[PDB]
Design an enzyme around this catalytic site. Structure first.
Site, PDB file in Angstrom:
ATOM      1  N   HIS A  41     -41.672 -50.406  -9.331  1.00 23.16           N
ATOM      2  CA  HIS A  41     -42.182 -51.707 -10.219  1.00 23.16           C
ATOM      3  C   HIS A  41     -40.952 -52.678 -10.010  1.00 23.16           C
ATOM      4  CE1 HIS A  41     -38.484 -51.222 -13.380  1.00 23.16           C
ATOM      5  NE2 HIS A  41     -39.246 -48.743 -12.873  1.00 23.16           N
ATOM      6  N   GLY A 142     -31.739 -51.650 -17.158  1.00 23.07           N
ATOM      7  CA  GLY A 142     -31.274 -51.670 -16.001  1.00 23.07           C
ATOM      8  C   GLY A 142     -30.925 -50.300 -15.571  1.00 23.07           C
ATOM      9  N   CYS A 144     -33.332 -47.373 -14.201  1.00 19.98           N
ATOM     10  CA  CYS A 144     -34.000 -47.791 -13.529  1.00 19.98           C
ATOM     11  C   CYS A 144     -33.095 -47.252 -12.096  1.00 19.98           C
ATOM     12  CB  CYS A 144     -35.460 -48.208 -13.267  1.00 19.98           C
ATOM     13  SG  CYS A 144     -36.210 -47.726 -14.516  1.00 19.98           S
TER      14      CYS A 144
HETATM   15  C1  4WI Z   1     -35.524 -48.938 -15.221  1.00 18.92           C
HETATM   16  N1  4WI Z   1     -34.645 -50.209 -15.362  1.00 18.92           N
HETATM   17  C2  4WI Z   1     -36.107 -48.740 -16.989  1.00 18.92           C
HETATM   18  C3  4WI Z   1     -35.445 -47.913 -17.983  1.00 18.92           C
HETATM   19  C4  4WI Z   1     -35.994 -47.881 -19.115  1.00 18.92           C
HETATM   20  C5  4WI Z   1     -35.354 -49.061 -20.532  1.00 18.92           C
HETATM   21  C6  4WI Z   1     -35.568 -48.148 -22.064  1.00 18.92           C
HETATM   22  N2  4WI Z   1     -34.913 -46.905 -21.446  1.00 18.92           N
HETATM   23  C7  4WI Z   1     -35.669 -46.600 -20.237  1.00 18.92           C
HETATM   24  O1  4WI Z   1     -35.492 -45.508 -19.737  1.00 18.92           O
HETATM   25  N3  4WI Z   1     -37.599 -48.305 -17.118  1.00 18.92           N
HETATM   26  C8  4WI Z   1     -38.338 -48.840 -17.448  1.00 18.92           C
HETATM   27  O2  4WI Z   1     -38.265 -50.285 -18.242  1.00 18.92           O
HETATM   28  C9  4WI Z   1     -39.870 -48.529 -17.637  1.00 18.92           C
HETATM   29  C10 4WI Z   1     -40.769 -49.508 -16.553  1.00 18.92           C
HETATM   30  C11 4WI Z   1     -41.956 -50.858 -16.934  1.00 18.92           C
HETATM   31  C12 4WI Z   1     -41.540 -50.189 -18.675  1.00 18.92           C
HETATM   32  N4  4WI Z   1     -41.053 -48.742 -18.833  1.00 18.92           N
HETATM   33  C13 4WI Z   1     -40.267 -47.981 -19.969  1.00 18.92           C
HETATM   34  O3  4WI Z   1     -39.214 -46.931 -19.654  1.00 18.92           O
HETATM   35  C14 4WI Z   1     -40.882 -48.068 -21.061  1.00 18.92           C
HETATM   36  N5  4WI Z   1     -41.879 -46.816 -21.399  1.00 18.92           N
HETATM   37  C15 4WI Z   1     -42.870 -46.809 -21.204  1.00 18.92           C
HETATM   38  O4  4WI Z   1     -43.989 -47.464 -20.359  1.00 18.92           O
HETATM   39  C16 4WI Z   1     -43.925 -45.284 -21.682  1.00 18.92           C
HETATM   40  F1  4WI Z   1     -43.841 -45.061 -22.140  1.00 18.92           F
HETATM   41  F2  4WI Z   1     -45.112 -45.263 -20.907  1.00 18.92           F
HETATM   42  F3  4WI Z   1     -43.366 -44.457 -21.207  1.00 18.92           F
HETATM   43  C17 4WI Z   1     -40.381 -48.604 -22.531  1.00 18.92           C
HETATM   44  C18 4WI Z   1     -41.057 -48.524 -23.617  1.00 18.92           C
HETATM   45  C19 4WI Z   1     -39.371 -49.728 -21.826  1.00 18.92           C
HETATM   46  C20 4WI Z   1     -39.000 -48.125 -22.886  1.00 18.92           C
HETATM   47  C21 4WI Z   1     -41.926 -49.502 -16.826  1.00 18.92           C
HETATM   48  C22 4WI Z   1     -42.555 -50.144 -14.771  1.00 18.92           C
HETATM   49  C23 4WI Z   1     -43.182 -48.485 -16.603  1.00 18.92           C
END
Ligand code: 4WI
Ligand code: 4WI
Lengths: 298, 297
Positions: A41, A142, A144
């Site tokens: 992603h 940040g 991921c």
């Molecule tokens: C990578 N940098 C982030 C890590 C996130 C940020 C907040 N806590 C974490 O672990 N990953 C993301 O931002 C992923 C990414 C888009 C949105 N996302 C999420 O983790 C979101 N959650 C969801 O989509 C859910 F609920 F389905 F799990 C968010 C609301 C920002 C926590 C993608 C492509 C899934």
């Protein structure tokens, strides 16, 4: 004496962490050999709604990847999908690639996290996989691409790469082969985590750990058969224990039988009586038998 | 949630070496052309009080065995710096990182690289208690394990493990040879004074619980700083000097320090069978900075 949740040293992993930027996204990647593995992603043009990854890859511009390691930049030769991860061939082999393998972690098993904040390793701590394929891992924006690993017999095993956080706070990632743990999707759609089933083997190790530390206020002479505990477990969201022989070392060094500790679980699951075990107010299933024996007998 | 985390240990791992003298085996810190380790590695009988200066006079430098992976070191000279043996060796550590020595104070957190007979085995965070002790996880062969903290791009070595008290507390020295809490590196029963909890750290621990959604323990009731400090002096808690260190934590959570100070007095009495971040009692191991790091980066 003592018991602390520990992480194996991260020195062998830190040279493999890189910043991966593309478009509007910046996260971490794993630089091993001539590859940089990272969550796919990072090339998503719009993370606010469902992503068509087939369309995102079909239009990828290799020149837009900005991979950095200290003053070094790595150029991307090619980019493909492996599951939910991007596999980026790069123009340089990591000179600090350790002897490594890949494998998947299973529920109730422990491993280490190197939390990285946009290519900069920030912290290290141990985690334990939950029944639904999640972990509680203090991941924020940040982070991921942060890597989970396990060290054993001189080999480095990569076992986890972070992707998302569920609405309930639980954290979700994939093995390095791109298979999301728990079957979750790397789509920004709401997703649910089922009931958390606590590891019965880990709780027994947690109680054996307290006994070894000299904390014996909770144990009695009462016992419970394994079959009775398993019946209680499959009714109270606890995993079944397959054998009492799996704790033969901990029972031999403490003199306490497993069936005695099974009695303690059902009794303590009702409440600790205002007291604590190793500073915890409730039963803890984040410590494995392997992980207790390590801390306390070497 | 909230978990004790360690700063990455890669910069320190190349400095750990196995130090063996006779049947004694522990760990040492290899910096420059020197290996620092607890001096009781040369003790002939660790069950009795030791005449260290006399033991060093009767030391055979060739009886040392210092190694790490594909490195093996020979001892040139040996001296004491406080309670630490300082061994000059015939090879420099080619990967000696820029570093300083300083001492941690009560309430301060730092990282422990737990080492088992020369092999770095784990890393985890700890907190210095009022009586100069820490609660970690040390067993036989883990002496010489180093504690470090990375502040502002600067590496600091701040701890070397030496012994365990009868109550389970763990005692070590700074890298200058000064034992924390003034304890002695002798097999003699010593006692730890009353432990004073860090009020700054408990406020941070409750802020982190609020951030995690655990807010059953809260109320609109509050308690002034002057009032809390008067209570802290007689209940084994430190005084709070200001609310500025929590201005940010209060900004995000929207909860004031005075609200959480009342929670301490009330929760100090007991949690009533309930938990806060898995704990059944107040926790003073996380500092304001620690919580701000994990929660916000
Ligand atoms: C990578 N940098 C982030 C890590 C996130 C940020 C907040 N806590 C974490 O672990 N990953 C993301 O931002 C992923 C990414 C888009 C949105 N996302 C999420 O983790 C979101 N959650 C969801 O989509 C859910 F609920 F389905 F799990 C968010 C609301 C920002 C926590 C993608 C492509 C899934
Ligand atoms: C170094 N490898 C060990 C680490 C110890 C062993 C178990 N847990 C630890 O932290 N340090 C020692 O063996 C030191 C060392 C001699 C005896 N010792 C102790 O820690 C003992 N403690 C005491 O005598 C006490 F309580 F009085 F401080 C022991 C009973 C083994 C815990 C010396 C030179 C003090």
């Amino acid at each position: 004496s003592g018991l602390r949740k520990m992480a194996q040293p991260s020195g062998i992993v830190e040279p493999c962490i890189v910043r991966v930027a593309y478009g509007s996204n910046v996260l971490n990647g794993l630089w091993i050999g001539d590859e940089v593995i990272c969550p796919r992603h990072v090339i998503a043009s719009d993370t606010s709604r469902v992503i068509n990854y087939d369309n995102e890859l079909s239009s990828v511009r290799l020149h837009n990847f900005s991979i950095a390691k200290n003053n070094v930049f790595l150029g991307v030769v090619s980019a493909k999908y492996k599951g939910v991860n991007l596999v980026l061939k790069v123009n340089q082999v990591n000179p600090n690639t350790p002897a490594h393998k890949f494998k998947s972690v299973k529920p109730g098993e422990s491993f280490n996290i190197l939390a990285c904040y946009e290519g900069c390793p920030g912290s290290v701590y141990g985690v334990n996989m939950r029944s639904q394929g999640t972990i509680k891992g203090s991941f924020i924006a940040g982070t991921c691409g942060s890597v989970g690993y396990v060290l054993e017999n001189g080999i480095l095993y990569f076992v986890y790469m972070h992707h998302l956080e569920l609405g309930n706070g639980s954290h979700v990632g994939s093995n390095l082969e791109g298979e999301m743990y728990g079957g979750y999707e790397d789509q920004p759609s709401m997703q649910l985590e089922g009931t958390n089933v606590m590891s019965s083997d880990n709780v027994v190790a947690f109680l054996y750990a307290a006994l070894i530390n000299g904390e014996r206020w909770f144990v009695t002479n009462a016992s419970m058969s394994l079959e009775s505990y398993n019946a209680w477990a499959k009714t109270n969201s606890f995993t079944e224990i397959v054998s009492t022989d799996a704790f033969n070392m901990l029972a031999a060094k403490t003199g306490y039988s497993v069936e005695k500790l099974l009695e303690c679980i059902v009794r303590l699951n009702k409440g600790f009586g205002g007291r604590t075990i190793l500073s915890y107010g409730s039963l803890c299933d984040e410590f494995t038998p392997t992980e207790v024996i390590r801390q306390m007998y070497g």
